[PDB]
Amino acid sequence: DFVLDNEGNPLENGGTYYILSDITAFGGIRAAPTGNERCPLTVVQSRNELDKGIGTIISSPYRIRFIAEGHPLSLKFDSFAVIMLCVGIPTEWSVVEDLPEGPAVKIGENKDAMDGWFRLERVNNYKLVFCPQCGDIGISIDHDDGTRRLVVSKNKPLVVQFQKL
Numbered sequence: 383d384f385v386l387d388n389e390g391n392p393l394e395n396g397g398t399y400y401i402l403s404d405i406t407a408f409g410g411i412r413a414a415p416t417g418n419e420r421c422p423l424t425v426v427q428s429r430n431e432l433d434k435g436i437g438t439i440i441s442s443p444y445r446i447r448f449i450a451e452g453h454p455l456s457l458k459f460d461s462f463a464v465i466m467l468c469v470g471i472p473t474e475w476s477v478v479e480d481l482p483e484g485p486a487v488k489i490g491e492n493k494d495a496m497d498g499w500f501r502l503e504r505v506n507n508y509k510l511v512f513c514p515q516c517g518d519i520g521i522s523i524d525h526d527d528g529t530r531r532l533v534v535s536k537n538k539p540l541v542v543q544f545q546k547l
Contacts, residue, residue, distance in 0.1 A: 383450060383451060383504070384448050384449065384450045384451075385449045385450060385451060385502045385504075385508060385544070386506045386544075387399060387506070387543075387544040387545060387546050388402070388506060388543050388544060388545050389545075389546065390506070391546065392448040392449070393440060393448060393449040393544060394447065394448060394449070394546075395440075395441055395442055395444075395446055395447055395448060395449055396439065396440075396441045397439070397440065397546060397547075398437040398438065398439050398440075398460050398546075398547040399437065399438055399440060399544040399545060399546055399547060400434040400435055400436075400437060400438070400544070400545045400547065401435060401438055401542050401543075401544060402434065402435075402542060402543045402544070402545055403427060403540075403541070403542060403543070404507050404541035404542065404543060405541075406431060407431055408427055408428060408429065408430075408431060408530070409427070409428030409429065409430045409431055409432065409433030409434065409435055410427075410428055410433060410434045410435025410436070411425060411426070411427055411428070411435045411436065411438065411532065411542075412425075412426060412428055412433070412435040412436045412459075412462070413425055413426070413436065413459060413462065413473075413489055414426045414529065416524070416527065416529055416531065420467065420468070421464060421465075421467070421468035421471055421490060422464060422468070422489075423471075423488050423489055423490040424486070424487075424488055424529075424531055425475060425486075425487040425488060425489060425531070425532040426529055426530055426531055426532060427521055427530040427532065427540065428530075429528060429530065434545070436459045436460060436462045437459070437460035437547045438457055438458065438459055438460065439457075439458040439459075439460055440455060440456075440457060440458075440544075441455065441456050441458075442454055442455050442456070443456070449502070451501070451502055451503050451504060451508075452501055452502075452503070453501065453502070454499035454500075454501060454513075455499055455500040455501060455502065456474060456475075456499070456500070457474065457475035457500055457510075458473055458474045458475065459473035459475075459489060460473075460547075461473075471489070471490045471491065472489065472490060472491060473489050473490075474489065475487055475488075475489060475500065476488050476489065476492050476495040476496070477495070477496045477498065477512050477514075477534055478492050478494050478495055478496070479494050479495075479496055480494055483522045483524075483531060483533050484522065484533045484534065484535060485512075485517070485533060485534045486522075486531060486532070486533045486534075487512075487519065487531075487532035487533065487534075496512075496514050497514060497515045498512055498513045498514040498515055499512075499513050500512055500513075500519075501513060501516065505539070505541050506543060506544075507541045507542065507543055508541070508542055508543075508544075509539035509540060509541055509542070510539070510540065510542065511539075512534050517534035517535065517536065518534065518535060518536065518537075518539035518540075519532055519533070519534055519535075519539065519540055520532075520533060520534070520535035520537045520538060520539050520540050521533070521535075521540050522535065
């Protein structure tokens with residue numbers, strides 16, 4: 383069926399949505415710098431329930447108007463604040479292979495980036511899944527920095543909702 387936002391309307395191919403958390407405790411998805419990263423290249427889930435995160439442009443290569451489950455997808459952050467040094471980086475979501483935390487979701491320029499598509503499946507909650515050329519996108523917490531990183535994990539998938547911008 384069609385993926386629906388929290389107002390009961392079908393997701394529009396190319397529209398901008400906030401990816402909110404099922405849990406009333408967490409906020410939306412956004413970017414942050416982790417490790418040796420100077421630019422916010424790591425896709426993370428906000429710890430602040432009042433934080434909606436960055437608007438995400440959701441599109442499918444298919445010539446359809448409304449996004450449906452199983453449709454191959456591309457996720458791209460809308461514009462957000464970055465230091466001058468990071469101006470111009472790609473904001474498309476990518477899954478990067480070789481990494482301690484497992485394949486991780488990152489933005490910016492990546493060589494070790496896997497080829498594939500994201501897909502949505504009903505769980506109005508859904509879970510993100512990645513299919514290389516499919517793993518549930520879940521959360522991996524770094525207890526030192528408290529950061530909640532988006533990684534593909536056979537563990538409990540991250541359950542989300544969409545709010546049209």
